[PDB]
Structure 1
Amino acid sequence: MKSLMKPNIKRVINATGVVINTNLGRAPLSKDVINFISEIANGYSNLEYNLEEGKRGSRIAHIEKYLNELTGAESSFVVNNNAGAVFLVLNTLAEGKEVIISRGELVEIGGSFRIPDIMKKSGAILREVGTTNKTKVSDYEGAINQNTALLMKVHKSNFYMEGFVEEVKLEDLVKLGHKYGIPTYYDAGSGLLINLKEFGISVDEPNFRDCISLGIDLVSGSGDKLLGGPQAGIIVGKKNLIEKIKKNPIARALRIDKLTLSGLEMTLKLYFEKRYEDIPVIRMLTQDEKALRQKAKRLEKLLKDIPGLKISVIKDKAKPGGGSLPELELPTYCVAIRHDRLSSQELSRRLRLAEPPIVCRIREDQLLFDMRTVFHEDLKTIKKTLQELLSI
């Protein structure tokens, strides 16, 4: 067409202050990682080749070692996404047999992924216990039978519940699973690699290393979330299970590509090297209450001149994680702006059609810019784009 002249996929300025943003492409990547991906993809590589033996070799093989070490699992595996990892795990272990799960955990993440729908297409039988808000242990145990193949737990990533609510301590499931000799599978989904409380964020958000040490047979999660990697189905646990999973032919359709594989490796390397500030998602969530102010007012300083603009700086409690930490509320600083000639709604609309475009949160005709998600070289382009729409 003539709308195919210029690419439809384009870089976007996130002013929503939502670190994990489903709509905006989730975790962005460090320039360190990306030059590595670029480097790998510019020409040929050792992808499925073992240079030592001069023959073809497993492409997953290196990535695994990282995960095995960082996380502590017996073994591991990686596929296209977590969605597939779930599907793969189910289809491999639970075909035609029962899978027990809480009525509180049967979740739709995104538009196209529904636990029960994919479990059906998985060829597994869903056995749902407890209630929406509350689920005891007696619920999981009571549903065990000759045909129970799997005890599964899903972590509610994109919503939370408050009020009267009960949940089952993972410790309990694993106890149950030993008693009846049923394996425990945990879709964590955020793919948090290590404990959050290390970095100054106080939350009960589960991770690989810790859940592994709990005794959960299998755990999966996304690469592109709290792990701040490329899109990836990350699976870790007991050797005999992973081996069974790898053996499944479906795993071939779910096989990760050169780019993600490399970008992932690099991401993992950073983790071993303990370079947390070099993965953008972690950085953005661990930023200092003052740093946000410092970056907030530097924008106001660039916005005062423009005609017709009332600018304020506010301090607010907002939720920072969209896809990963729904309960989390953190203090941050937003630059609020209002215009005489135009409503905020017509202002956000124009901000979306800009080049480059800018997406911002909105509260009662107060256009807001959360600085948690804003880069330093974004400021310059924000000003330039604000003056071009109104000073045209």
Structure 2
Amino acid sequence: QISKVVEIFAKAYPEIYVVKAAREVAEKYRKEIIEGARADLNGFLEDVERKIKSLMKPNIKRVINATGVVINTNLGRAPLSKDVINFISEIANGYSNLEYNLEEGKRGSRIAHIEKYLNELTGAESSFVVNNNAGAVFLVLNTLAEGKEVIISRGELVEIGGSFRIPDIMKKSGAILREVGTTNKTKVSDYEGAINQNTALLMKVHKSNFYMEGFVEEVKLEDLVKLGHKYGIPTYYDAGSGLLINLKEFGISVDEPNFRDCISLGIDLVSGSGDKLLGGPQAGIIVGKKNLIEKIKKNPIARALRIDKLTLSGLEMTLKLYFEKRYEDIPVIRMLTQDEKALRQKAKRLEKLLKDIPGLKISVIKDKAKPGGGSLPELELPTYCVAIRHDRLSSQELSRRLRLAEPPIVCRIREDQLLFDMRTVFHEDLKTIKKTLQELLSI
């Protein structure tokens, strides 16, 4: 019973956790024994103690990312420069002029603090910001095309993440969905073909987390705009990457689309996540024509999507950085634009820390990985891994224990050889890497 387990650990662990550890372990042996899968009760003493050790720590923990994927959906997307985290810390520490204008001394709209930055950086007439890009979509449809049709290419009906899908959202959006062209190809005649009285919207979505090769055709963006200005229809581009600037300017050569460029091209509305290529905290970012934004703003779901104090502040600081050309300060930009050189530099500095540890086979390989996970699907870039192999322990079991470390470490596996992509690894992590390994193979 739970009272005997409270007697076994008196001062050992606080009474509150011990009973929550006996209640979860006791439902686990009640169901394992009912199903007839357990013949021994002896593991009960150690496991109620491991639960207590575990239940006494946070579920969400910082993790050292070895995979060399900058934008790791599973690992928390764009991490944040300390500068920013500090400004977020300060604003959360007490009250703040969130919804308060200091000039007039009367309430004010919280989305007003930021928008000045967006409209300067992109060039759009006005702007706005909601919970994530997801809702930013759901908002631009339900606002603009409730009960009327929207035209989109059959190749752009994406499923990104686990629950999101343009057709399943747009439906619930209340917009009527008109799918032109074919999977692989879509000409301009396909869009123009389906125009009619009901058509309220010309939407294009960017294939963020996939890509098609082979015989493939797509509708030029200059073309969608010409088309809409013909029949008097608004265009709506879901970047999704929400890349904020031209990326070629950093030496990486891709066609990824960005706010500034897409707007000056003549699209009427653009959106994208903030926790992607922008580098910030999670946010739906929407920019374009004044008359449209106003309309979005006034829709009463906007209040159900409006951003929290934490992501609001933190977004301002990241926007600040971007105005100050302080690029290297926003993690997701530095990690992609890191010099091939620089990577090696780090690679061998690590190797140097592990030489001494027993049983460790350590080598430095130059590999081609694909860094972007949720925003740059075709991108392939050279990065140096430190592959390691232990005589006593196998690569699989290695990863596993590394994931259970404090802090935990997550990495790629490849042909029974553990790898460490240096693209995503922070310096202060190296010392913690060495201490982790030596605690595992010497214990």
Deviation per CA, 1:55-102: give whole Å up to 9, x if none. 111111121110000000000000010000000001000101111111
- Bigger relative contact order, structure 1 or 2, given CA contacts below 8 A and separation 6+? 1
CA displacement at 1:223 relative to structure 2: 0.6
- 1:2 deviation in Å? 7.2
Query: Residue by residue, what CA displacement relative to the aligned partner does 1:5-51 show, whole Å, maximum 9, x if unpaired?
Result: 21100000000000111011000001001110000000000000110
**In 2, Cα distance between the equivalents of 1:100 and 1:230?**
31
Q: Does 1:153 align with 2:204?
A: yes
Q: How big is each residue's C-alpha offset from its partner over 1:268-291, in whole Å with a ceiling of 9 and x where there is no partner?
A: 111111111111100111000000
User: d(CA) in 2 for partners of 1:285 and 1:247?
Assistant: 38
1:311 shift after superposition: 0.9
Q: Secondary structure at the match of 1:54?
A: coil
Distance 1:241 1:352 in 2: 47
Give secondary structure in 2 for the equivalent of 1:161.
coil
Distance (whole Å) between structure 1 residues aligned to residue 269 and residue 429 of structure 2: 41
Matched position secondary structure for 2:200? strand
1:125 and 2:192 matched = no
The separation in 2 between residues aligned to 1:338 and 1:103, in whole angstroms, is: 47
Per the alignment, residue 285 of structure 2 pairs with 234
After superposition, the C-alpha distances for 1:299-353 in whole angstroms (9 at most, x for unaligned) are 1111111111111100111101111111110111000111212221111111111
2:215, 2:325 → 1: CA distance? 40
CA distance in 2 between counterparts of 1:126 and 1:351 reads 47
Cα deviation digits, residues 159-182 of structure 1 (max 9, x gap): 111111111110010011111111
Residues 81-230 of structure 1 aligned to structure 2 (within 5 Å)? 81-230=132-281
- 1:286 alignment partner, SS class: coil
Gaps of 5+ in 2: 1-51
| Secondary structure of 1:322's aligned partner | coil
1:189-209 Cα deviation digits (max 9, x unpaired): 111111001111111010000
Classify the secondary structure of the residue corresponding to 2:204: strand
Distance 2:202 2:162 in 1: 26
Residues 345-390 of structure 1 show CA distances to partners (whole Å, capped at 9, x for unaligned) of: 1111111111111111111112110000000000000110011111
User: In terms of mean alpha carbon deviation, does 244-253 or 301-310 score higher?
Assistant: 301-310
Task: Provide the rounded CA distance (Å) in 2 between the counterparts of 1:148 and 1:5.
Answer: 56
Query: What is the CA–CA distance in structure 1 between the aligned matches of 2:322 and 2:357, rounded to whole Å?
Result: 44
* Equivalent position to 1:311, from 352, 357, 362: 362
Q: Which runs of 4 or more aligned residues in structure 1 lie more than 3 Å from their structure 2 counterparts after TM superposition?
A: 1-4
**Count of matched residue positions in the alignment of Structure 1 and Structure 2:** 392
RMSD after superposition: 0.9
Secondary structure at the counterpart of residue 274 of structure 1:
coil
Task: Find the counterpart in structure 2 of residue 244 from structure 1.
Answer: 295
Could you tell me how far apart the structure 2 residues matched to 1:129 and 1:366 are? 47
Seq. identity, % = 100
Provide the rounded CA distance (Å) in 2 between the counterparts of 1:135 and 1:252: 37
Whole-Å separation in 2 of the counterparts to 1:356 and 1:73: 43
How many angstroms apart in 1 are the aligned matches of 2:267 and 2:231? 14
Distance (whole Å) between structure 2 residues aligned to residue 351 and residue 125 of structure 1: 49
C-alpha displacement at 1:3, in angstroms? 4.6
Counterpart Cα distance in 2 of 1:295 and 1:136: 47
Partner residue of 1:2?
Answer: 53
Secondary structure of 1:285's counterpart equals: coil
The alpha carbon displacement at 1:183 in A equals 0.5
Question: Whole-Å Cα distance in 2 between the matches of residues 175 and 365 of structure 1?
Answer: 54
**Bigger CA drift: 268-277 or 370-379?**
268-277
SS at match of 1:228: coil
- Offset from partner CA, 1:214-269 (integer Å, 9 cap, x none): 00000000111110011000000001110000000000000101111000011111
Which segments of 5 or more consecutive residues in structure 1 lack a partner in the other structure? none
Question: What are the equivalent positions in structure 2 for 1:342-381 lying under 5 Å apart?
Answer: 342-381=393-432
Deviates more, 1:140-149 or 1:250-259: 140-149
Structure 2 Cα separation of the partners of residues 193 and 211 of structure 1: 10
Aligned residue number for residue 74 of structure 1: 125
